[PDB]
Design a protein around this ligand. Structure first.
Ligand SMILES: Nc1ncnc2c1ncn2[C@@H]1O[C@H](COP(=O)(O)OP(=O)(O)O)[C@@H](O)[C@H]1O
Ligand SMILES: Nc1ncnc2c1ncn2[C@@H]1O[C@H](COP(=O)(O)OP(=O)(O)O)[C@@H](O)[C@H]1O
Ligand SMILES: [Mg+2]
Ligand SMILES: [Mg+2]
Lengths: 794, 766
DNA sequence: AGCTGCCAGGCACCAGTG
DNA sequence: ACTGGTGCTTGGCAGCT
């Protein structure tokens, strides 16, 4: 209603504004007007509430006024942060043209869009956490999925088979922004995820993605990257790249590759395993008391992020795991020397992303130069270490003698945060800049001489010479002496208690000082953009050096932990099996104020399922987890919390624990995934669940399930249960064996020994645990009477 | 031994070391060291080599309210000499910015005799002062959960520290603050009494010790008299239905299991219109009273006000939060809008009096009197304050014209002088011929004539230049500084007067504070009763009757929350519990409706005992002392500990609701405990119990022993799914559905087949 | 060391001569 | 159609106390 708001009824300003806002209909538009970014209509109302700024209005000759808000251009970063923390994208519009030569409103382009998965600036990101853009897509048969780390170039592609692998892939990558195709059927994977972004179907067309990705990589086809085979993934990867290009609107030279992640190249862990193993996130949501809290004492941000990627994605290549282990063993003695030097390399990876996007600030290049200064010390230290993988990483990190020198001669020791104000480029780097700097010590040299000279000539002791941004340079005299000033003194600015003047000499100095300051700032910015021109050709080798430095940090880290926390090197056997001697839960052993009871395990194709019994709090769940963490750690190359481990190949880890609406339904569908997708190479942890509607309702299914895992699938299965009935299984079924966690009953109390023993328990301790919980003794007596009745059945 | 500015910060922190210290620094308050680290964690702000964290001045009240909501006291240190000029503690705030509208905010004190416990709460806004002497650990943990103090005073030597350890706002105090002769003296002097007999607490030494410490703390925190605190009341165990934390949490009274406010009993029942009414309604929900006298009176009121709720609720809405506004009148912190709202509420009382005049109900007519009229104070504020005054009195414009002759006089002179300076602008503008000429006002120059730069050179020679701007010149003349004196001295005399007339309004209002407090409380209760009357009528509730002996007879009853939330028809169900039929063993499916049927029993009992009508065609109900709930979900240990608590503390007047006790351990162990639990509850305690179980063996109970019956729910298979029927019918169940749910989960058919075989095998020995 | 209010640079608006 | 004056976000700081 009201105001038919056709093109002609709008002002030149609003015509141009709505045109640019139409290119970004559903996200905020910062709109450059002089020294402000301004928002309008609903953008202004929302921006007012989110940014906590005033909602005002611009006047209008045609109809209703225009809602309005905005912030000074020099304060954008603070408000951009406030927005991105809440998941808001923002289009940044700048003025391109000169207002002095524009008849109407000046040309305005959107130069970039800040979205939560495409941020590369240091103040909007978290140091030790990745921030990944992603694209997902589904059709009849399966999924395609891509991730990009814009602040590094790591571009990945996968084709998860089913709902549960896709779920576990979203869990593992944890994207900050998720682009998804409009026809996505399984919204239950995607709903209530952050930075969610519905995208047209055409953005996932295969021919277009192949064209765009080959263009980006400079290849004819993607044979060389291992993804020509993989249209499902490619379609997601296409949408992803198109988004990235649209948000940055510059070339993205740091995205020179893409890699497919195949199912069989890593150990797939279902979403429950990840949570129950508490790899980077405990069950309460926080980061305390995780696997990563204990294992992660990396000394640089990029190293930490790399370690967590490895923990979340164990590899199956025997060769890569052996090399990682050797590195850990070879570098163990040189931990204390290598670590303070690696710390000084910093997050070189993210600085190089900003270099590639041309957004690198003067303190970015200073820390890049500081990193180069650490390379010869690290080359010397790694020379002595006779390990082929250690020397390959020493080669990969390079030295960059010529660039370390370039940055030392071009930038101040400690430059400002930004280049806008100057003071970044050093003396000697450019001859023209130094003769344009005849000004910085031309001022107060000259102005103090003009002050004293005119103070003495005039005889007026209050006379001083100053500058003011608005009125320029001046000669100030006090009000009480101002009636004595020369008539030559042209009057410039008046104040309450002082008059200020200008004279032909000082005006001439004002014009020249300011023209040359503008010339010195423009040249400085030309020279700083030129630093990018000379650094960028070496981008590949630099990215390789960051990666080698980050991997060094991970491995030097894992070496130190292996020593400090008493870990041993695992070996690998040809067939399924796990043989542990005196193994411990790597996390529970650290947090426990008292000694962790170490425990064995024998698992093999002959001894492939263990039924685990023992009282509540007896240590059954812990024993299972620590098996899986030891498997996990072994398959990232790391040493392991035990006296000795021998471990076969694993394809998948499955965890089924107790549980939204119907708890038995969900527990049963989670069990079905396990029975449908497990193999002879999978490790399977089955913990206690809810009962069915009746007594033996659920035990029936636990028996039938156990037997399917023993007899059909033949996976390696630990099966913790309170059902003592399942201790008869070994008798009846090949591959199945009883173990139990020990407990001494002594008098009216129970002690939990946390020690695994072969065989079933002697008894179950339900009544005992209940008595520990404070159930009246008369009730426990009655329950023990009822128990004898039930035990006389057989 | 640090920098000159940080030498002052450290000495000031020594005065209040246990409290976070805001320290003024230009446009920011700034915290240092352990204050900076703790506050960056609590408030989501940065950490800056001295640690520092800063809040901007313009949002100081928002961030004070965030810290105070997490149990933190906060000292502010303003101006160069400095001093702690303000302190907010969580349990003693009364400012609308720092308070949540619809949540109570209590100060509390706790302490321990060899004889037992002492407890005391205070709502510093309402004046509501309560004490108790819980008999043991579990009852004291129960009063702590329910009252939920924002700040808890406690003795140095408190032995039972596990009761309060995790709580926010813990304030360790000396033992001499709980000395009893000093507690009586201070309390009597606060109340104007000689003994505490009239408040019914003269013989409650443990309780008074806590209330004395509480009072001293509140006083020290305000440095004002607290005249609105004129009474104290003692809650006794017999007076209410006790509920432990687990039960309070499982019945989801005001807070759902995920910490939210949605899908709770309060979300449905609480449609009150004033914030003071909502608070009173939630106090009732969490404290069912057992005195049927009080209960019959609320019922009567709920039925008598049936045809009067459409008329009353719009009017009551406009009364607003008169309770919290009166607190600020008592503390002399009330602002012009506080007085404006008090006026608007007085403007409603005549209409409310006429509407209630016809209501045939003795309790409504007494609330109608207690409500009062206050026509003289309504006139005062009508004449004294303008229609919509500014937030603060600071800048005047709050006193109306006609109220004071002296004030009108100074305003007429200030207006006359600004009228002359407007005419001065127009006169000087024609005389010079300079169209840009105007008169502005400033702090640093006062009044001045401005002329644009381009025209400034044609300024008359009698003008004296004072400020050059980028594109203008500002001058003064003797005429300007003469009429500047005229406006400034007039506006200032009229500002000091307004301020003194404002203070005078407190002198005239406060003499009637006691009756005003009774009016706001009565208006709150009306709001509650009228809400409950609208609820009963709208939601098809009925009025329960009370019987002398334990028993719950429900006809077609429902879960009051579940029925409003889901868009599927709510199947109503019966219940007949009596001394002859004390326990029901509930069998049947998962998602079958057991937990709902148990919880609705408890909700109906709870609602009957706040005086409300109930979701049912009929409910008769005997006395209940306690409601126990062991419903939902190391977990086995926590469930056994709750089970243990029930068996120790339940009586024959208790409602006990148990769910799948036994699941977690072995079949024989779990069944053995379940059996022996049923037995105890059924034979020893004789509590009216509902025992949901999966053990079908437990259905043999009714045959073995008296007062035990089977009931069950069933399901129905059709199409490609299950239809759980949600209808409770007599007898044990004859079907399980676990295997059926596994089939629909995708568990392979061949696994199901093997389980079917194994189930028949397993059941046949029974 | 603190309060106030001009200024930053884009537009459009509006009134006063063309 | 042309001149010269108004208006509006917030952060920085000159210019007064
Ligand atoms: N082997 C161990 N040594 C020392 N403490 C242990 C060990 N295993 C478990 N615990 C402790 O026992 C507690 C309960 O163990 P849990 O595995 O959950 O028993 P269950 O699952 O059988 O009921 C854990 O909190 C852990 O701290
Ligand atoms: N009487 C009923 N009429 C309609 N819906 C019901 C009824 N009883 C329960 N429900 C709904 O069915 C769901 C599952 O039943 P539930 O209360 O959990 O019993 P159980 O312990 O057997 O699973 C509940 O979440 C509730 O919303
Ligand atoms: Mg367990
Ligand atoms: Mg239930």
């Amino acid at each position: 209603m009201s105001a038919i708001e056709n093109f002609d009824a709008h002002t030149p300003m609003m015509q141009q504004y709505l045109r640019l806002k139409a290119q970004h209909p559903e996200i905020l538009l910062f709109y450059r007007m002089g020294d402000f970014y301004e928002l309008f209509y609903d953008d202004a109302k929302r921006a007012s509430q989110l940014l906590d700024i005033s909602l005002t209005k611009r006047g209008a000759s045609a109809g209703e006024p225009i809602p309005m808000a905005g912030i000074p251009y020099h304060a954008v970063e603070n408000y951009l942060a406030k927005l991105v923390n809440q998941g808001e994208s923002v289009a940044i519009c700048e003025q391109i043209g000169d207002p002095a030569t524009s008849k109407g409103p000046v040309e305005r382009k959107v130069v970039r869009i800040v979205t939560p998965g495409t941020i590369s600036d240091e103040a909007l990101l978290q140091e030790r956490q990745d921030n990944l853009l992603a694209a997902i897509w589904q059709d009849s048969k399966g999924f395609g999925y891509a991730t990009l780390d814009i602040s590094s170039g790591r571009f990945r592609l996968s084709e998860p088979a089913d709902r549960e692998t896709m779920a576990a892939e979203l869990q593992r990558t944890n994207p900050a922004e998720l682009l998804y195709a409009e026809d996505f059927a399984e919204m239950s994977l995607i709903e209530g995820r952050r930075g969610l972004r519905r995208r047209p179907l055409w953005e996932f067309e295969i021919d277009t993605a192949r064209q765009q990705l080959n263009l980006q990589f400079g290849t004819r086809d993607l044979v060389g990257f291992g993804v020509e085979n993989a249209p499902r993934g490619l379609c997601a990867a296409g949408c992803l790249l198109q988004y990235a290009k649209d948000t940055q609107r510059t070339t993205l030279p740091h995205i020179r590759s893409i890699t497919m992640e195949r199912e069989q190249d890593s150990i797939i862990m279902d979403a429950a395993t990840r949570r129950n193993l508490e790899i980077t996130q405990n069950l309460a949501g926080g980061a305390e008391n995780t696997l990563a809290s204990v294992l992660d004492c990396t000394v640089t941000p990029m190293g930490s992020r790399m370690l967590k990627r490895w923990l979340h994605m164990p590899v199956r290549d025997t060769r890569v795991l052996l090399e990682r282990q050797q590195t850990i063993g070879a570098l163990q003695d040189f931990t204390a020397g290598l670590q303070p030097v690696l710390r000084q390399v910093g997050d070189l990876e993210r600085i190089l992303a900003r270099l590639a996007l041309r957004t690198a600030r003067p303190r970015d290049l200073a820390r890049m130069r500081h990193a180069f200064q650490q390379l010869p010390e690290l080359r010397a230290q790694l020379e002595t270490v006779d390990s082929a993988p250690v020397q390959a990483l020493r080669e990969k990190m390079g030295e960059f003698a010529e660039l370390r020198d370039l940055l030392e001669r071009a930038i101040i020791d400690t430059p400002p945060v930004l280049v806008r104000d100057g003071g970044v480029i050093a003396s000697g780097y450019n001859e023209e800049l130094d003769e344009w700097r005849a000004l910085a010590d031309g001022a107060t040299d000259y102005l103090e001489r003009l002050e004293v000279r005119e103070r003495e000539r005039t005889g007026l002791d209050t006379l001083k010479v100053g500058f003011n941004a608005v009125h320029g340079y001046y000669i100030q005299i006090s009000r009480g002496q101002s009636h004595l000033a020369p008539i030559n003194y042209m009057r410039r600015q008046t104040l309450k208690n002082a008059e200020r003047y200008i004279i032909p000499e000082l005006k001439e100095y004002e014009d020249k000082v300011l023209t040359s300051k503008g010339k010195a700032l423009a040249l400085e910015k030309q020279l700083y953009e030129e630093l990018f021109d000379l650094l960028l050709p070496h981008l590949e080798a630099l990215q390789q050096s960051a990666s080698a430095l980050a991997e060094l940090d991970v491995l030097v880290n894992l070496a130190e932990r292996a020593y400090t926390l008493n870990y041993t090197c695992p070996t690998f056997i040809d067939k399924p099996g796990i043989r542990i001697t005196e193994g411990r839960h790597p996390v529970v052993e650290q947090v426990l104020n008292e000694p962790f009871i170490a425990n064995p395990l024998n698992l093999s194709p002959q001894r492939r399922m263990l039924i685990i019994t023992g009282p509540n709090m007896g240590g059954k769940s812990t024993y299972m987890r620590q098996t899986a963490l030891i498997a996990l750690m072994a398959y990232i190359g790391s040493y392991v919390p035990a006296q000795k481990v021998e471990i076969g190949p694993i394809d998948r880890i499955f965890t089924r624990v107790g549980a939204g609406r119907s708890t038995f339904m969900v527990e049963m569908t989670e069990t079905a995934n396990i029975l449908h997708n497990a193999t002879e190479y999978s490790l399977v942890l089955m913990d206690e669940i809810g009962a069915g509607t009746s007594t033996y309702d659920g035990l029936s299914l636990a028996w039938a399930c156990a037997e399917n895992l023993a007899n059909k699938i033949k996976a390696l299965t630990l099966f913790a249960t309170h059902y003592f009935e399942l201790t008869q299984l070994p008798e009846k079924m090949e591959g199945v064996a009883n173990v139990h966690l020990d407990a001494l009953e002594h008098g009216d109390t129970i002690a939990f020994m946390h020690s695994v023993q072969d065989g079933a328990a002697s008894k179950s301790y339900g009544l005992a645990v209940a008595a520990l919980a404070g159930v009246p003794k008369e009730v426990i007596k009655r329950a023990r009477q009822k128990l004898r009745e039930l035990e006389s059945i057989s």
